[PDB]
């Protein structure tokens, strides 16, 4: 019940089209659900503070309409990107 949408145009290098919301603010214990609403595949990969991929939450490929969930059980700031479009970086802030 806390959603992040990957919107139409997320595949492009435009200002518009970033993950929605770009920083999801949630309390500990929340399930986060990403949905791909774009016209191309995407995925969700946790990255470290400097933007290097790490193994905290890592989705399979998501076709249009596919979903990925992760439960955030610890306070902190979590960045993520998409391995197909690494410049698309979002955050989940758990407090």
């Amino acid at each position: 019940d806390a959603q992040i949408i990957i919107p139409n145009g997320n595949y492009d290098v435009t200002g518009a089209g970033f993950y929605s919301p770009l920083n999801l603010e949630i309390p500990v214990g929340t399930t986060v659900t990403w949905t791909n609403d774009d016209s191309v595949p995407h995925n969700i990969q946790s990255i470290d503070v400097n933007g290097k991929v790490i193994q905290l939450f890592n989705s399979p490929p998501l076709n249009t309409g596919d979903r990925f969930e992760h439960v955030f059980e610890e306070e902190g700031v979590y960045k993520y990107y998409c391995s197909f479009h690494p410049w698309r970086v979002g955050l989940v802030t758990v407090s």
Copy 2:
């Protein structure tokens, strides 16, 4: 006091090289300073939740070493990007 750095390599079309911190968390009334530490010009433009440019804070072009400041007097979430590199989007979260 509440600094954001545009790092060397922010011009890169990839994840690493994003604004540091990507979400700056500050209390209301704080003066925020962006510094361009990159090797090319950048700017800072406030955008809304859909990525449309708005006139809340808008910098001139910043050369290497240049700084831009904005005082955030109100509570809220403020997205911004660079019109030269629109894929580079960050936030200031004011509480």
Copy 3:
């Protein structure tokens, strides 16, 4: 007989979705046929090392389902791209 397909998703700014095959190997004198199977317009332009368009084989805009043909009568390695999606660069290798 010697075909290159522009697949659905070629407009994507990423690896997957590239021309199929990305390097077409053909004997000299062969007629090569490109087909646009994607859902947006594309074109086929021969380019130089600097990604500037050169005059050798240069298609009109290709609508979905449209085809473009060129007869390759000289041996050599021929780069081409799409001016709408210049990151999509392929080869025809004639021997």
Copy 4:
């Protein structure tokens, strides 16, 4: 010999800046060397015929001036990209 250059500007989504040569033709048993001549980090990851990353030859990050090598012992066509810039796709063709 068997060198591929990652040129200046390869980080961008432009026509210019593709791997040089885009297709490297070599005989079996050849050591191939990639060199990063760009102003940002790159890496080299083998991908399958459709452009999905696979474990076959996979470099660490390459800073400016760094090299990566792989010995190609088997005939075939081997695509690769960069995990930082997935749209930059090249080939090694082994005969």
